[PDB]
């Protein structure tokens, strides 16, 4: 069962009530580039899954359960307090993400929140290298047909040397090193079975990766509502069985005549109440970003060529655009 009354397990967090939807900054914040990193310790997926066996999340709010589906979620926000790598807006991104999901009544069975902000209601643990890795394995490990997964990262993205690649920096990166995108892809995407939907939001400043995903679409300045966009194949081969959807920000691909963009994109998308298609919704989001003086335009990437005429959702399997090979 899912907890449906506030008396079941007692009082649950009202994140909207704490002002996390409308009373926090939804403006860009500055992300200073971390710079080149030494080579990371590569992920041992077996150890990751081993270390994930004891772990659980909690139900963050009551909502109406979706029949035949369970929802699990992992949220990671890192402000790197006290360091030269300090960021002002990453844990705040998680705040808005959490409030937006609540406001929309996404019925999450178990959530894990890894933030470095003190006294953050519902904080599970610190976003260390070992916690990010093991909780990533936690998120995907019990995935059965019908399951819905949600992943959110706000923090530094950077490049690191190989023994270059894109990588994200845990709060303890100084001591434990970064995590390469190859390993994130292997943990979070590669192990999903068929008929499992995942949405992953990566809000990391500069490193606008798409995590080795085969399909992408960038909603650049020249796209119009009265156009018909399609995803493109940008990588040969595919190791992802499940339905993975990734939201991130990149530089405009239109030829010309930092922090918080990916989070505004997915929150604006969700807060739009009118059941728009991926395509129409991305135009509106692109306009919102330009309005609020974001550097980035929205980028949708996926493990299949999504028909962008399909309605946007967090819970549904993809309708495939057969015209994309
Ligand atoms: Sm890579």
- CA distance linking residue 194 with residue 148, whole number of Å: 12
> For tokens 């959110």, what's the residue?
152
Residue that has been written with the tokens 């409308």 in this structure: 22
Using alpha carbons, list the distances in angstroms from residue 261 to 38, 60, 153, 171, 295. 27, 25, 12, 21, 8
Q: Are strands 157-160 and 165-168 parallel, antiparallel or unpaired?
A: antiparallel
Question: How many angstroms separate the alpha carbon of residue 220 from the centre of ligand 1?
Answer: 24
| Integer angstrom CA distances of residue 154 from 74, 122, 125, 146, 214 | 12, 17, 15, 27, 23
Mapping DSSP to helix (H, G, I), strand (E, B) and coil, where does residue 300 land? Answer: strand
Experimental method: X-ray
CA distance 236 to 18: 46
Alpha carbons 305 and 229: distance in angstroms, whole number: 11
In angstroms, the CA 46 to CA 49 distance is: 5
Closest Cα to residue 48, out of 132, 160, 171, 126? 132
Can you tell me the distance from the alpha carbon of 67 to that of 70, in angstroms, rounded to the nearest whole number? 8
**Integer angstrom CA distances of residue 208 from 19, 189, 204, 250, 309:** 29, 17, 7, 5, 25
For residue 201, count other CB atoms closer than 10 A to its CB. Answer: 23
Contacts 24+ apart (CB under 8 A), 282-287: 282/217, 282/219, 282/223, 282/229, 282/308, 283/219, 283/223, 283/224, 283/225, 285/219, 286/219, 286/220, 286/221, 286/223
CA of 209 to the centre of ligand 1 (A): 8
- How far does residue 26's CA lie from ligand 1's centre (Å)? 30
Q: How far is the CA of 61 from the centre of ligand 1 (A)?
A: 36
Ligand 1 mean position, distance from CA 71 (Å)? 28
String of DSSP letters for 198-213? EEEEEE-TT----TT-
Bridge partners, residue 72, by sequence: 110, 149
Instruction: Measure 211 CA to ligand 1 centroid, in angstroms.
Output: 7
- 119 CA distance to ligand 1 middle (Å): 35
Alpha-carbon span 89 to 154, nearest angstrom: 8
Distance 41 CA to ligand 1 centre (A): 15
């Amino acid at each position: 069962s899912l907890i449906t009354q506030l008396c079941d397990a007692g009082q649950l967090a009202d994140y909207v009530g704490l002002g996390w939807l409308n009373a926090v900054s939804s403006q860009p914040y500055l992300v200073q580039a971390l710079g080149l990193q030494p080579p990371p310790r590569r992920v041992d997926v077996d150890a990751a899954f081993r270390d994930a066996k004891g772990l659980h999340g909690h139900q963050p709010w009551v909502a109406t359960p979706l029949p035949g589906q369970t929802v699990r979620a992992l949220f990671i926000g890192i402000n790197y307090y006290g360091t030269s790598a300090a960021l002002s807006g990453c844990c705040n991104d998680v705040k808005q993400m959490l409030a937006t999901l609540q406001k929309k009544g996404l019925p999450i069975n178990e959530a894990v929140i890894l933030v470095d902000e003190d006294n953050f209601p519902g904080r599970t643990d610190q976003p260390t290298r070992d916690n990010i890795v093991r909780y990533m394995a936690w998120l995907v490990k019990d995935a059965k047909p019908g399951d819905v997964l949600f992943f959110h990262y706000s923090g530094h993205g950077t490049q690191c040397k190989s023994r270059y690649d894109q990588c994200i920096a845990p709060v303890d990166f100084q001591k434990s090193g970064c995590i390469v995108d190859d390993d994130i892809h292997k943990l979070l995407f590669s192990r999903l079975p068929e008929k499992v939907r995942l949405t992953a939001v990566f809000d990391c400043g500069h490193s606008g990766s798409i995590m080795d995903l085969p399909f992408t679409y960038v909603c650049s300045g020249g796209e119009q509502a009265s156009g018909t966009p399609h995803m493109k194949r940008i990588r040969e081969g595919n190791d992802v069985l499940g339905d993975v959807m990734m939201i991130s920000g990149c530089a405009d691909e239109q030829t010309s005549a930092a922090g918080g963009a990916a989070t505004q994109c997915i929150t604006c998308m969700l807060m739009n109440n009118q059941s728009l298609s991926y395509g129409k919704l991305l135009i509106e989001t692109r306009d919102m970003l330009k309005r609020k003086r974001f550097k980035q335009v929205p980028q949708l990437s996926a493990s299949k060529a999504i028909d962008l005429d399909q309605t946007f959702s967090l819970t549904e399997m993809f309708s495939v655009d057969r015209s994309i090979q």
